[PDB]
Design an enzyme around this catalytic site. Sequence first.
Site, PDB file in Angstrom:
ATOM      1  N   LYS A 184      93.546  60.780  -3.400  1.00  0.00           N
ATOM      2  CA  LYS A 184      91.745  61.317  -3.970  1.00  0.00           C
ATOM      3  C   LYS A 184      91.742  59.945  -4.132  1.00  0.00           C
ATOM      4  CE  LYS A 184      88.867  63.332  -6.512  1.00  0.00           C
ATOM      5  NZ  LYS A 184      88.290  64.667  -7.837  1.00  0.00           N
ATOM      6  N   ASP A 197      81.814  72.057 -11.390  1.00  0.00           N
ATOM      7  CA  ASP A 197      81.338  72.609  -9.894  1.00  0.00           C
ATOM      8  C   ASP A 197      81.911  73.680  -9.720  1.00  0.00           C
ATOM      9  OD1 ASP A 197      80.228  72.109  -7.987  1.00  0.00           O
ATOM     10  OD2 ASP A 197      81.537  70.232  -7.302  1.00  0.00           O
TER      11      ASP A 197
HETATM   12  O1  LIG Z   1      89.003  66.566  -6.089  1.00  0.00           O
HETATM   13  C1  LIG Z   1      90.625  67.093  -6.218  1.00  0.00           C
HETATM   14  O2  LIG Z   1      91.012  66.906  -7.499  1.00  0.00           O
HETATM   15  C2  LIG Z   1      91.316  67.375  -5.526  1.00  0.00           C
HETATM   16  C3  LIG Z   1      90.837  67.096  -3.668  1.00  0.00           C
HETATM   17  C4  LIG Z   1      91.964  67.707  -2.741  1.00  0.00           C
HETATM   18  C5  LIG Z   1      93.408  68.551  -2.933  1.00  0.00           C
HETATM   19  N1  LIG Z   1      93.414  67.849  -4.546  1.00  0.00           N
HETATM   20  C6  LIG Z   1      92.608  68.284  -5.212  1.00  0.00           C
END
Ligand SMILES: O=C(O)c1cccnc1
Length: 319
Positions: A59, A147
């Site tokens: 990410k 969220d």
């Molecule tokens: O934004 C996150 O924490 C995320 C998004 C996709 C996969 N794993 C984590």
Amino acid sequence: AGSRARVYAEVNSLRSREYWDYEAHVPSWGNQDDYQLVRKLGEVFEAINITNNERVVVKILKPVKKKKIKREVKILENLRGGTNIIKLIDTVKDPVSKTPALVFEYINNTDFKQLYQILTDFDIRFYMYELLKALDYCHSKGIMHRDVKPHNVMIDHQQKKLRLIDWGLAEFYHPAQEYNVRVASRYFKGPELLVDYQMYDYSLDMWSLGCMLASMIFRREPFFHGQDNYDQLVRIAKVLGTEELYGYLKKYHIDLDPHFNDILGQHSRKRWENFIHSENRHLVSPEALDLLDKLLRYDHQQRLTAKEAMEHPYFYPVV
Ligand SMILES: O=C(O)c1cccnc1
């Protein structure tokens, strides 16, 4: 004197300051060159760790920040090993751009828009219970996710695995702290956010969980479908009742935005049984509705805690 959480109220004050003072946190940034970013994850990429060929998720963060970066990293590190919490594996920077990224365990998500259509009563109980395991844990760790929504609940239905992801909006709870009410995603915003009440707590997440529960057992997704934040309160009060809303506001000395005076109208409190029809009857039960009623209520302080919800008869088949 506002309100405070009924549980885990003081647990951050009982911890070392370094635990919650995320602005003081100094991440150890690794080299992102250890990762081969192969595809978009159906700004998150599937990636391969060049060293051990293990598949992960990367990410990409927003470099100009600092504060929200330190906050998300600190909360993720604090929650490491937490039940059904997405596991942070590493924190790295691209060696050229210096742009921070987070490396996560891989999970094969089934799009919730297809998954929810074939969930049984048992499945919904099962996954809600897994999700509660996550929320009870992060709240016990003094953290509100802020969220909760289907997109942030990854489910691999083949392996019956669930992970609460995206802790970018998460905050530490401190009693009497005033927070940003522009958090969460519209359909899952609790009433306290929609009426500009800033002294909220873990129970914000429980309202969002309740929203999810409602959409899964009733097959109306999202369940409260606002067109904006103003209309979102309207959709809620069309169900929970308008006189009931004023009661809530009266109790916590909240004054309702004058804009609402023309669009709120007058609405009775609907019995949950009114949302039952032939298309969801096999997902609904009295235990389901009694739980739902104790989650989707205006008064955040009275909503069940994650732990209380877990003790409810609805999860008797999954405990
Ligand atoms: O934004 C996150 O924490 C995320 C998004 C996709 C996969 N794993 C984590």
